[PDB]
């Protein structure tokens, strides 16, 4: 690996620097190097990994949607360039998703013993299979979709047994699983039911929280509310 010669702590330090400089490709490369040191990641380190790759793939998804819309308007004969460039961005996006899924499979998930870390990595696995499903059209599209579902579902089962309803990673997992139901699985009623049940059970648990935990949980509850207002 290109980062094999740099200290683990130096990679973490430089990932935080790249975040400040809004250099998210560098940030992702640094955290990939940190993961490949073979040690488990702390809560802070897991978030750095997540933020880096979410920003990288977020720009690729936004670009893919721009090009896909142009491509659809063109097919409503004018040259192969639009399809070619959409395919180029698509292939780069799939490469990043495959890289993240490789880090999770080797060997972040299998070494995640606590519910907190295991749910985190399974939510990541669901997210990046979902991003693969957004662009999928081939023989394996249904298997990609079910791979996202299976990872989300295991994370949901763990979070319901081991976490309170206001736990931020439990809330974020339910939010993204509901987005999966609505946008990928074409199950809007399941999406709405999950978002409502998650919001209501979090609302009833707020009384147990400090001011700092209250802020974290209500932030994600507001995202659930935003989708419910969009969907109903």
């Amino acid at each position: 690996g290109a980062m094999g010669s740099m200290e683990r702590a130096s990679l973490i330090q430089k990932a935080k620097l790249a975040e400040q400089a809004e250099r998210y490709e560098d940030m992702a490369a640094f955290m990939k190097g940190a993961v490949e040191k073979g040690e488990e990641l702390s809560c802070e380190e897991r978030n750095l990994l997540s933020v880096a790759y979410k920003n990288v793939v977020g720009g690729q998804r936004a670009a893919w949607r721009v090009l896909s819309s142009i491509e659809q308007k063109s097919n409503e004969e004018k040259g192969p360039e639009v399809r070619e460039y959409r395919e180029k961005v698509e292939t780069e996006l799939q490469g990043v998703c495959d890289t993240v899924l490789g880090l999770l499979d080797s060997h972040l998930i299998k070494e995640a013993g606590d519910a907190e870390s295991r749910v985190f990595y399974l939510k990541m696995k669901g997210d990046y299979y979902r991003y693969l499903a957004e662009v999928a059209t081939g023989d394996d599209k249904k298997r990609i979709i079910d791979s996202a579902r299976s990872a989300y579902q295991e994370a949901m089962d763990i979070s319901k047994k081991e976490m309170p309803p206001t736990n931020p990673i439990r809330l974020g997992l339910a939010l993204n699983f509901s987005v999966f139901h609505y946008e990928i699985a074409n199950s809007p009623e399941e999406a709405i039911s999950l978002a409502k049940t998650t919001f209501d059970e979090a609302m009833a648990d707020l009384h147990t929280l400090s001011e700092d935990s209250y802020k974290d949980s209500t932030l994600i509850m507001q995202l659930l509310r935003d989708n419910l207002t969009l969907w109903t």
Binding site: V179, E183, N227, L230
Partner: peptide, 8 residues
């Protein structure tokens, strides 16, 4: 519009 997934 598109729905909201987790964002930092």
């Amino acid at each position: 519009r598109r729905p909201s997934s987790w964002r930092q």
